[PDB]
Amino acid sequence: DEANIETNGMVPMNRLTDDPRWLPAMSERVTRMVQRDRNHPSVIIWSLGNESGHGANHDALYRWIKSVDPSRPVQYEGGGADTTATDIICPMYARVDEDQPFPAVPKWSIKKWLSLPGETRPLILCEYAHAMGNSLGGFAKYWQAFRQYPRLQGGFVWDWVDQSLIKYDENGNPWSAYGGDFGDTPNDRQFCMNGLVFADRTPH
Amino acid sequence: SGIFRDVSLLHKPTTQISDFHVATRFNDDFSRAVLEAEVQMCGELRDYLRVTVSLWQGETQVASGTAPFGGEIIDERGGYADRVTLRLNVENPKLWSAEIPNLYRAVVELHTADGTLIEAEACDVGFREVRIENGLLLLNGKPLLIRGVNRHEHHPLHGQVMDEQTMVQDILLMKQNNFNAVRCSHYPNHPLWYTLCDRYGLYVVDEANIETNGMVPMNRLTDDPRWLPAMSERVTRMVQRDRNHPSVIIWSLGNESGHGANHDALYRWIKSVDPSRPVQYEGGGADTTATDIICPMYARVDEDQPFPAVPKWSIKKWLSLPGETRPLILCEYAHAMGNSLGGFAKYWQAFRQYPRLQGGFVWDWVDQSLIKYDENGNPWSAYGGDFGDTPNDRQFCMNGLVFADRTPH
Ligand SMILES: CC(C)S[C@@H]1O[C@H](CO)[C@H](O)[C@H](O)[C@H]1O
Ligand SMILES: CC(C)S[C@@H]1O[C@H](CO)[C@H](O)[C@H](O)[C@H]1O
Ligand SMILES: CC(C)S[C@@H]1O[C@H](CO)[C@H](O)[C@H](O)[C@H]1O
Ligand SMILES: CC(C)S[C@@H]1O[C@H](CO)[C@H](O)[C@H](O)[C@H]1O
Ligand SMILES: [Mg+2]
Ligand code: NA
Ligand code: NA
Ligand code: NA
Ligand code: NA
Ligand code: NA
Ligand code: NA
């Protein structure tokens, strides 16, 4: 269960989340979600949000949940996926064998990540296997790694269903549309479609 | 068998230096150190005796200290009236490493207060710290990448007798081929070996002469207290002899003798007597309580070999097993028997990518073939069985990177 907090577009990504002036609004997005959903057995982990860098606010909120509901681990990928705000190493798109040593927020090979000096947590990717169009190449490589390594505990594929929207043609026939198709601009064109299934649930 | 090491006669005064131990500790960034030399004597104690320990960098004496015997208070009964510890400060010491084997000379003099020498002992001193921190083996604070090899003491004509020339030849070839470390498989070596390592610069794993491979199960003797005494002397006498060599950076409890309680006891003894060097031991699955380093033999890079009780996990996988935090350095890998070393690069690529994979010791340096002569006196290399020995293990004695005469494979 994930809080409704995403500040992907700020520069740097944690501009708002490291700002105490934004702590109050953030705080409610986390607290009110916990108050609402805490009794559902299906919810096994709480998440602080998504792509909002790593700021102090995340740290305060992580601690709040640990206090109020010790029954579920808290995870958060921002700022490098292994910050002090997460109980689980939960990278997005880290590869199996190949390291991607980006500065500040490297995405190490998942096998290598587990064993960096002092690292002890389990690794579960918050997103992997971007199923955009004709994709899923290399899916097997992950599964093999997950089965071999106790601490590699799986992941969440990105994602379930294409976010395409129906439009109608001149003769009123329906067709699947993506970004830019509504005159919207700027837009990110087909990036909205990354699912294992078509919008109508027919599988890819 | 036989008397295969040197024989000598040593004359000592009745009042003599019976032991001395040298240690070097440092500040955080190694720009300061303190050398501590504990000296013990035998013979009659006299208030006029003194010990002076002086440290030299080449021709220059950089530090010196003198004191009468009488160590500090140890317990309710007092201290050692027969020992003394001198402490010398050293600013910006030149550090020892296999890259730059800088050495100083420590001279221990037993003499009278008025200046008359009774006797002098001495050793080469390498200022270096060995420690494992945060899961990594550090030397002078930097993480090592062990380019090692296991080396037996073997000569094709002379058997197990070692000579200076052969040892230097081996060292030069090792360095020339990019090795920086050597494991004493699987016994203390001829004394000169250490001197050469100290001076030419190689990291050394000094290993107790204990291997009970053929027992069933392997730890049958090592888990038996009745064998604790004998094993104990193979460990303790090694430390007492070699503890002052800076090239020795890790002590080893022996090899292929399973994991038994005697090993835990001896692991602890070393930890207690010489905290300056990690202790490793592979028996019993390579990650027991008697080892500071996960030190498997022949574990593969990616492939697991889940043998019961003593699995050999893929090294990459091993490091991250739940709760595992130690560095991993294979005590033996890349078995070079015959036309071999296939897959070598695979290990190097892993070592470079994983911080806690800190290398390994190839098995092994030199083919243990022996020379035989045909009817015309022409020599040929022989292996197991060629002397009428039986049973025997045939060519398994030949696993080196180099042929017995030092020609490379
Ligand atoms: C993109 C590569 C250089 S990453 C490279 O792949 C290898 C396979 O060839 C190994 O498995 C290594 O772990 C990995 O670093
Ligand atoms: C395209 C990258 C620069 S951002 C990348 O975009 C994806 C688009 O489907 C997802 O939204 C990922 O979560 C996001 O990290
Ligand atoms: C080689 C020494 C100067 S290190 C010196 O030791 C001190 C204790 O004697 C303290 O630990 C200092 O912090 C340390 O730098
Ligand atoms: C042959 C194996 C069952 S034991 C194997 O034999 C090798 C022969 O070179 C080495 O002696 C290894 O240390 C030993 O484990
Ligand atoms: Mg000489
Ligand atoms: Na797993
Ligand atoms: Na666009
Ligand atoms: Na998308
Ligand atoms: Na490494
Ligand atoms: Na045989
Ligand atoms: Na052999």
Short mmCIF file of N, CA, C and O in Angstrom, two decimals, chain A residues 6-118:
data_model
loop_
_atom_site.label_atom_id
_atom_site.label_comp_id
_atom_site.label_asym_id
_atom_site.label_seq_id
_atom_site.Cartn_x
_atom_site.Cartn_y
_atom_site.Cartn_z
N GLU A 6 4.31 11.70 -5.19
CA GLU A 6 5.28 11.59 -6.28
C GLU A 6 5.65 12.99 -6.79
O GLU A 6 4.77 13.76 -7.22
N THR A 7 6.95 13.29 -6.69
CA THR A 7 7.49 14.61 -7.08
C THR A 7 8.60 14.47 -8.13
O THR A 7 9.61 15.20 -8.13
N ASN A 8 8.39 13.52 -9.00
CA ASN A 8 9.37 13.17 -10.02
C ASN A 8 9.96 14.36 -10.78
O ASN A 8 11.14 14.34 -11.09
N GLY A 9 9.11 15.32 -11.13
CA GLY A 9 9.51 16.48 -11.91
C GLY A 9 10.31 17.57 -11.27
O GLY A 9 10.80 18.43 -11.98
N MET A 10 10.49 17.56 -9.95
CA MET A 10 11.27 18.62 -9.33
C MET A 10 12.71 18.44 -9.69
O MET A 10 13.16 17.38 -10.15
N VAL A 11 13.50 19.46 -9.46
CA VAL A 11 14.94 19.33 -9.73
C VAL A 11 15.65 19.93 -8.52
O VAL A 11 15.46 21.14 -8.28
N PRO A 12 16.47 19.18 -7.76
CA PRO A 12 16.69 17.73 -7.84
C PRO A 12 15.36 17.08 -7.40
O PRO A 12 14.38 17.75 -6.98
N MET A 13 15.26 15.76 -7.49
CA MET A 13 13.96 15.16 -7.17
C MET A 13 13.47 15.36 -5.72
O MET A 13 12.24 15.34 -5.47
N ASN A 14 14.38 15.53 -4.78
CA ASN A 14 13.94 15.68 -3.41
C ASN A 14 13.69 17.13 -2.98
O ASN A 14 13.71 17.42 -1.78
N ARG A 15 13.49 18.09 -3.93
CA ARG A 15 13.37 19.51 -3.57
C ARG A 15 12.24 19.78 -2.56
O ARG A 15 12.41 20.56 -1.60
N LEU A 16 11.10 19.13 -2.79
CA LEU A 16 9.97 19.31 -1.86
C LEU A 16 10.09 18.39 -0.64
O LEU A 16 9.85 18.75 0.53
N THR A 17 10.45 17.14 -0.92
CA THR A 17 10.55 16.15 0.19
C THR A 17 11.63 16.40 1.21
O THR A 17 11.57 15.81 2.30
N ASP A 18 12.62 17.29 0.90
CA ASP A 18 13.66 17.60 1.86
C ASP A 18 13.30 18.90 2.59
O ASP A 18 14.01 19.37 3.46
N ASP A 19 12.17 19.47 2.18
CA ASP A 19 11.66 20.73 2.70
C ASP A 19 10.57 20.59 3.76
O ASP A 19 9.48 20.09 3.49
N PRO A 20 10.92 21.03 4.97
CA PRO A 20 10.03 20.92 6.12
C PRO A 20 8.74 21.62 5.87
O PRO A 20 7.74 21.27 6.45
N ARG A 21 8.72 22.60 4.96
CA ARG A 21 7.45 23.26 4.67
C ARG A 21 6.46 22.33 4.00
O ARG A 21 5.25 22.51 4.09
N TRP A 22 6.98 21.29 3.37
CA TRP A 22 6.12 20.30 2.73
C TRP A 22 5.88 19.08 3.63
O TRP A 22 5.12 18.21 3.23
N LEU A 23 6.47 19.03 4.82
CA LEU A 23 6.25 17.91 5.68
C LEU A 23 4.78 17.70 6.03
O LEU A 23 4.17 16.61 6.02
N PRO A 24 4.08 18.77 6.36
CA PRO A 24 2.68 18.60 6.72
C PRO A 24 1.79 17.95 5.65
O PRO A 24 1.05 16.96 5.88
N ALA A 25 1.86 18.44 4.42
CA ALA A 25 1.05 17.82 3.37
C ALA A 25 1.48 16.34 3.10
O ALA A 25 0.67 15.48 2.79
N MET A 26 2.79 16.09 3.16
CA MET A 26 3.27 14.75 2.95
C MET A 26 2.76 13.89 4.06
O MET A 26 2.22 12.80 3.85
N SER A 27 2.94 14.43 5.26
CA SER A 27 2.54 13.63 6.38
C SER A 27 1.11 13.15 6.29
O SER A 27 0.76 12.00 6.60
N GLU A 28 0.22 13.97 5.81
CA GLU A 28 -1.10 13.38 5.77
C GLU A 28 -1.28 12.33 4.73
O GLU A 28 -2.20 11.55 4.80
N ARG A 29 -0.46 12.37 3.70
CA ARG A 29 -0.72 11.39 2.67
C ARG A 29 -0.31 10.00 3.15
O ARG A 29 -0.81 8.98 2.67
N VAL A 30 0.58 10.01 4.12
CA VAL A 30 1.02 8.74 4.70
C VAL A 30 0.14 8.33 5.84
O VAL A 30 -0.42 7.25 5.89
N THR A 31 -0.05 9.25 6.78
CA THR A 31 -0.85 8.91 7.96
C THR A 31 -2.28 8.52 7.66
O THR A 31 -2.82 7.61 8.31
N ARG A 32 -2.91 9.22 6.72
CA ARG A 32 -4.30 8.92 6.44
C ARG A 32 -4.49 7.62 5.68
O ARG A 32 -5.56 6.94 5.70
N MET A 33 -3.39 7.25 4.99
CA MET A 33 -3.51 5.99 4.29
C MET A 33 -3.43 4.88 5.38
O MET A 33 -4.19 3.89 5.39
N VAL A 34 -2.45 4.99 6.30
CA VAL A 34 -2.32 3.98 7.39
C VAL A 34 -3.58 3.82 8.25
O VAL A 34 -4.10 2.70 8.49
N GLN A 35 -4.16 4.98 8.62
CA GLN A 35 -5.39 4.96 9.40
C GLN A 35 -6.54 4.19 8.72
O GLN A 35 -7.42 3.53 9.32
N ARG A 36 -6.53 4.31 7.39
CA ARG A 36 -7.60 3.71 6.59
C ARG A 36 -7.43 2.23 6.33
O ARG A 36 -8.39 1.47 6.41
N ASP A 37 -6.18 1.84 5.99
CA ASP A 37 -5.92 0.49 5.54
C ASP A 37 -5.29 -0.52 6.47
O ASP A 37 -5.09 -1.67 6.02
N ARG A 38 -4.96 -0.05 7.68
CA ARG A 38 -4.20 -0.88 8.62
C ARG A 38 -4.77 -2.20 9.01
O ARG A 38 -4.07 -3.06 9.54
N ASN A 39 -6.05 -2.37 8.80
CA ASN A 39 -6.70 -3.64 9.18
C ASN A 39 -6.82 -4.68 8.07
O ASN A 39 -7.30 -5.76 8.34
N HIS A 40 -6.37 -4.37 6.85
CA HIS A 40 -6.43 -5.30 5.75
C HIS A 40 -5.25 -6.33 5.81
O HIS A 40 -4.08 -5.95 5.75
N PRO A 41 -5.54 -7.63 5.93
CA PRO A 41 -4.44 -8.57 6.00
C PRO A 41 -3.63 -8.56 4.68
O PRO A 41 -2.41 -8.82 4.71
N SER A 42 -4.24 -8.24 3.51
CA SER A 42 -3.46 -8.32 2.21
C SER A 42 -2.27 -7.34 2.13
O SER A 42 -1.30 -7.55 1.42
N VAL A 43 -2.40 -6.23 2.86
CA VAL A 43 -1.38 -5.19 2.89
C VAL A 43 -0.31 -5.78 3.77
O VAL A 43 -0.56 -5.99 4.96
N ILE A 44 0.82 -6.09 3.17
CA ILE A 44 1.94 -6.61 3.93
C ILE A 44 3.09 -5.62 4.15
O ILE A 44 3.87 -5.79 5.06
N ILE A 45 3.17 -4.57 3.30
CA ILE A 45 4.22 -3.55 3.36
C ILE A 45 3.61 -2.18 3.01
O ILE A 45 2.76 -2.07 2.11
N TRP A 46 4.10 -1.17 3.71
CA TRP A 46 3.72 0.19 3.43
C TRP A 46 4.83 0.83 2.63
O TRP A 46 6.03 0.64 2.87
N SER A 47 4.45 1.70 1.70
CA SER A 47 5.43 2.43 0.92
C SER A 47 5.15 3.94 1.05
O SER A 47 4.00 4.40 1.05
N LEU A 48 6.23 4.69 1.16
CA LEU A 48 6.20 6.18 1.38
C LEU A 48 5.90 6.96 0.13
O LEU A 48 5.88 8.17 0.19
N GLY A 49 5.66 6.30 -1.01
CA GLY A 49 5.43 7.07 -2.21
C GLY A 49 6.36 6.60 -3.30
O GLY A 49 6.84 5.45 -3.31
N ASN A 50 6.56 7.50 -4.28
CA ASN A 50 7.38 7.11 -5.43
C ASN A 50 8.14 8.30 -6.05
O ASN A 50 7.59 9.42 -6.09
N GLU A 51 9.36 8.03 -6.58
CA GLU A 51 10.14 9.04 -7.29
C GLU A 51 9.95 10.42 -6.75
O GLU A 51 9.50 11.36 -7.43
N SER A 52 10.37 10.55 -5.50
CA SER A 52 10.36 11.85 -4.87
C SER A 52 11.70 12.10 -4.22
O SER A 52 11.91 12.77 -3.16
N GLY A 53 12.70 11.54 -4.86
CA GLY A 53 14.05 11.63 -4.29
C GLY A 53 14.09 11.03 -2.85
O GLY A 53 13.23 10.21 -2.47
N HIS A 54 15.08 11.42 -2.05
CA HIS A 54 15.07 10.99 -0.63
C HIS A 54 15.21 12.25 0.21
O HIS A 54 16.26 12.93 0.16
N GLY A 55 14.21 12.65 0.97
CA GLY A 55 14.41 13.86 1.77
C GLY A 55 14.16 13.52 3.25
O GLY A 55 13.66 12.45 3.61
N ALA A 56 14.48 14.46 4.13
CA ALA A 56 14.30 14.29 5.59
C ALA A 56 12.87 13.91 5.95
O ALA A 56 12.60 13.19 6.91
N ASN A 57 11.96 14.46 5.16
CA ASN A 57 10.55 14.19 5.43
C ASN A 57 10.28 12.71 5.31
O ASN A 57 9.38 12.20 6.00
N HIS A 58 11.01 12.07 4.36
CA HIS A 58 10.76 10.65 4.20
C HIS A 58 11.21 9.95 5.50
O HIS A 58 10.59 9.01 5.98
N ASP A 59 12.31 10.40 6.04
CA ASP A 59 12.84 9.78 7.23
C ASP A 59 11.90 9.94 8.43
O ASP A 59 11.65 9.01 9.19
N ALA A 60 11.32 11.11 8.58
CA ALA A 60 10.38 11.32 9.68
C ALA A 60 9.17 10.41 9.49
O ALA A 60 8.67 9.77 10.42
N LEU A 61 8.68 10.36 8.26
CA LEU A 61 7.47 9.56 8.02
C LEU A 61 7.65 8.02 8.16
O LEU A 61 6.77 7.25 8.57
N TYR A 62 8.81 7.57 7.77
CA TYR A 62 9.23 6.17 7.89
C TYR A 62 9.15 5.83 9.42
O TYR A 62 8.56 4.88 9.84
N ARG A 63 9.75 6.67 10.24
CA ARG A 63 9.79 6.43 11.67
C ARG A 63 8.39 6.46 12.22
O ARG A 63 8.02 5.63 13.08
N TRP A 64 7.56 7.40 11.75
CA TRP A 64 6.15 7.45 12.25
C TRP A 64 5.41 6.11 12.05
O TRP A 64 4.72 5.58 12.92
N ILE A 65 5.52 5.55 10.84
CA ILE A 65 4.86 4.28 10.57
C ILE A 65 5.46 3.16 11.44
O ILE A 65 4.71 2.34 11.95
N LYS A 66 6.81 3.15 11.62
CA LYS A 66 7.47 2.10 12.41
C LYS A 66 6.92 2.14 13.82
O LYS A 66 6.76 1.12 14.47
N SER A 67 6.59 3.34 14.28
CA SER A 67 6.03 3.50 15.63
C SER A 67 4.59 3.08 15.74
O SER A 67 4.19 2.38 16.68
N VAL A 68 3.78 3.60 14.81
CA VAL A 68 2.35 3.34 14.86
C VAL A 68 1.95 1.91 14.42
O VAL A 68 0.92 1.40 14.89
N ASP A 69 2.70 1.29 13.50
CA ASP A 69 2.30 -0.02 13.01
C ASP A 69 3.54 -0.83 12.77
O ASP A 69 3.97 -0.93 11.67
N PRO A 70 4.11 -1.40 13.82
CA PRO A 70 5.31 -2.25 13.73
C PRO A 70 5.05 -3.57 13.01
O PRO A 70 5.94 -4.40 12.80
N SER A 71 3.80 -3.83 12.55
CA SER A 71 3.55 -5.13 11.99
C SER A 71 3.91 -5.29 10.56
O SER A 71 3.81 -6.37 10.05
N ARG A 72 4.24 -4.21 9.90
CA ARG A 72 4.55 -4.30 8.50
C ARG A 72 5.84 -3.55 8.16
O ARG A 72 6.02 -2.42 8.56
N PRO A 73 6.72 -4.12 7.34
CA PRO A 73 7.92 -3.40 6.92
C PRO A 73 7.54 -2.15 6.13
O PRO A 73 6.46 -2.14 5.52
N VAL A 74 8.41 -1.14 6.11
CA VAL A 74 8.15 0.07 5.32
C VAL A 74 9.21 0.10 4.23
O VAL A 74 10.40 -0.18 4.48
N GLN A 75 8.80 0.40 3.00
CA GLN A 75 9.84 0.47 2.00
C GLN A 75 9.67 1.78 1.22
O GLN A 75 8.57 2.39 1.27
N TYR A 76 10.73 2.20 0.51
CA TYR A 76 10.71 3.44 -0.32
C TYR A 76 11.93 3.42 -1.23
O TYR A 76 13.02 3.22 -0.74
N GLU A 77 11.76 3.59 -2.53
CA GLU A 77 12.86 3.50 -3.48
C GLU A 77 13.71 4.78 -3.70
O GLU A 77 14.89 4.72 -4.13
N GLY A 78 13.09 5.94 -3.47
CA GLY A 78 13.76 7.20 -3.78
C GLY A 78 15.12 7.41 -3.13
O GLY A 78 15.43 6.92 -2.02
N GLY A 79 15.95 8.15 -3.88
CA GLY A 79 17.29 8.51 -3.42
C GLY A 79 18.22 7.32 -3.45
O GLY A 79 19.17 7.28 -2.68
N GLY A 80 18.00 6.34 -4.32
CA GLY A 80 19.01 5.30 -4.29
C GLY A 80 18.58 3.90 -3.84
O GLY A 80 19.46 2.98 -3.85
N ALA A 81 17.27 3.77 -3.47
CA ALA A 81 16.63 2.48 -3.12
C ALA A 81 17.19 1.72 -1.88
O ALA A 81 16.73 0.61 -1.58
N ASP A 82 18.17 2.30 -1.16
CA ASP A 82 18.72 1.60 -0.01
C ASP A 82 18.97 2.64 1.04
O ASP A 82 19.86 2.49 1.81
N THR A 83 18.18 3.68 1.08
CA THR A 83 18.34 4.73 2.08
C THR A 83 17.83 4.31 3.45
O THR A 83 17.34 3.21 3.69
N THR A 84 17.95 5.26 4.38
CA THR A 84 17.54 5.01 5.74
C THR A 84 16.08 5.08 5.83
O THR A 84 15.54 4.93 6.90
N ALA A 85 15.44 5.32 4.74
CA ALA A 85 13.98 5.36 4.83
C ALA A 85 13.35 4.02 4.33
O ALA A 85 12.16 3.93 4.01
N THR A 86 14.12 2.94 4.20
CA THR A 86 13.48 1.75 3.69
C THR A 86 14.02 0.48 4.36
O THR A 86 15.22 0.38 4.64
N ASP A 87 13.17 -0.49 4.58
CA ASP A 87 13.58 -1.73 5.25
C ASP A 87 13.97 -2.76 4.24
O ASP A 87 14.50 -3.80 4.60
N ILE A 88 13.67 -2.41 2.99
CA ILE A 88 13.91 -3.36 1.87
C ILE A 88 14.67 -2.66 0.78
O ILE A 88 14.31 -1.50 0.46
N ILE A 89 15.71 -3.33 0.21
CA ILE A 89 16.42 -2.68 -0.93
C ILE A 89 15.43 -2.78 -2.09
O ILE A 89 15.09 -3.90 -2.50
N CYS A 90 14.87 -1.67 -2.59
CA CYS A 90 13.78 -1.87 -3.55
C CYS A 90 13.96 -1.05 -4.83
O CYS A 90 13.20 -0.15 -5.21
N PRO A 91 15.00 -1.38 -5.53
CA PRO A 91 15.32 -0.61 -6.72
C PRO A 91 14.32 -0.82 -7.83
O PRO A 91 13.57 -1.79 -7.83
N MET A 92 14.37 0.15 -8.76
CA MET A 92 13.58 0.10 -9.96
C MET A 92 14.51 -0.06 -11.15
O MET A 92 15.42 0.76 -11.41
N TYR A 93 14.29 -1.16 -11.89
CA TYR A 93 15.06 -1.44 -13.10
C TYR A 93 16.57 -1.78 -12.89
O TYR A 93 17.36 -1.60 -13.82
N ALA A 94 16.98 -2.23 -11.72
CA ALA A 94 18.35 -2.62 -11.54
C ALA A 94 18.40 -3.90 -12.32
O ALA A 94 17.43 -4.63 -12.33
N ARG A 95 19.49 -4.16 -13.02
CA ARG A 95 19.70 -5.34 -13.85
C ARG A 95 20.25 -6.49 -13.00
O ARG A 95 20.69 -6.36 -11.87
N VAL A 96 20.22 -7.66 -13.60
CA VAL A 96 20.65 -8.82 -12.87
C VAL A 96 22.18 -8.88 -12.62
O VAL A 96 22.63 -8.99 -11.48
N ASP A 97 22.96 -8.82 -13.71
CA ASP A 97 24.41 -8.93 -13.64
C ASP A 97 25.15 -7.67 -13.92
O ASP A 97 26.27 -7.48 -13.48
N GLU A 98 24.51 -6.77 -14.67
CA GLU A 98 25.14 -5.52 -15.09
C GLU A 98 24.98 -4.36 -14.13
O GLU A 98 23.86 -3.93 -13.87
N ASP A 99 26.05 -3.78 -13.63
CA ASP A 99 25.93 -2.59 -12.78
C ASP A 99 25.67 -1.35 -13.62
O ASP A 99 26.18 -1.27 -14.75
N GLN A 100 24.98 -0.36 -13.11
CA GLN A 100 24.75 0.96 -13.77
C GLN A 100 25.08 1.98 -12.71
O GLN A 100 24.27 2.41 -11.89
N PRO A 101 26.37 2.31 -12.67
CA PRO A 101 26.89 3.15 -11.59
C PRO A 101 26.60 4.61 -11.75
O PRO A 101 27.52 5.42 -11.80
N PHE A 102 25.34 4.95 -11.83
CA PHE A 102 25.02 6.36 -11.92
C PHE A 102 25.56 7.08 -10.67
O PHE A 102 25.58 6.63 -9.52
N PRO A 103 25.96 8.31 -10.86
CA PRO A 103 26.44 9.03 -9.68
C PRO A 103 25.29 9.27 -8.68
O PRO A 103 24.15 9.50 -9.11
N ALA A 104 25.57 9.23 -7.35
CA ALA A 104 24.61 9.49 -6.25
C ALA A 104 23.60 8.37 -6.04
O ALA A 104 23.33 8.02 -4.91
N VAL A 105 23.07 7.83 -7.13
CA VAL A 105 22.03 6.81 -7.08
C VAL A 105 22.28 5.70 -8.05
O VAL A 105 21.50 5.42 -9.00
N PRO A 106 23.40 4.98 -7.84
CA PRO A 106 23.73 3.85 -8.74
C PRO A 106 22.68 2.76 -8.69
O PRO A 106 22.01 2.60 -7.66
N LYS A 107 22.53 2.01 -9.78
CA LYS A 107 21.62 0.85 -9.78
C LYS A 107 22.58 -0.36 -9.93
O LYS A 107 23.03 -0.73 -11.04
N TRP A 108 23.09 -0.91 -8.83
CA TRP A 108 24.03 -2.02 -8.96
C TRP A 108 23.29 -3.29 -9.43
O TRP A 108 22.07 -3.51 -9.25
N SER A 109 24.04 -4.18 -10.04
CA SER A 109 23.57 -5.52 -10.37
C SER A 109 22.84 -5.99 -9.06
O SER A 109 23.38 -5.78 -7.95
N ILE A 110 21.66 -6.63 -9.13
CA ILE A 110 20.95 -7.00 -7.87
C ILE A 110 21.75 -8.00 -7.02
O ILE A 110 21.70 -7.92 -5.81
N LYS A 111 22.50 -8.91 -7.66
CA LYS A 111 23.34 -9.92 -6.97
C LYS A 111 24.46 -9.28 -6.22
O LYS A 111 24.84 -9.69 -5.12
N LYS A 112 25.00 -8.26 -6.81
CA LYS A 112 26.15 -7.55 -6.17
C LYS A 112 25.67 -6.62 -5.07
O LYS A 112 26.31 -6.42 -4.02
N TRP A 113 24.49 -5.99 -5.27
CA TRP A 113 23.94 -5.06 -4.29
C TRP A 113 23.81 -5.71 -2.90
O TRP A 113 24.10 -5.11 -1.88
N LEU A 114 23.26 -6.96 -2.86
CA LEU A 114 23.02 -7.59 -1.59
C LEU A 114 24.25 -7.67 -0.71
O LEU A 114 24.17 -7.63 0.54
N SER A 115 25.37 -7.91 -1.38
CA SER A 115 26.59 -8.10 -0.61
C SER A 115 27.52 -6.89 -0.43
O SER A 115 28.67 -7.06 0.05
N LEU A 116 27.05 -5.66 -0.70
CA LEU A 116 28.00 -4.56 -0.48
C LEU A 116 28.29 -4.49 0.98
O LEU A 116 27.44 -4.82 1.82
N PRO A 117 29.48 -4.07 1.32
CA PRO A 117 29.91 -4.03 2.74
C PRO A 117 28.90 -3.39 3.66
O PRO A 117 28.41 -2.26 3.41
N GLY A 118 28.55 -4.13 4.71
CA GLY A 118 27.57 -3.72 5.71
C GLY A 118 26.09 -3.94 5.29
O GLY A 118 25.17 -3.78 6.10
#
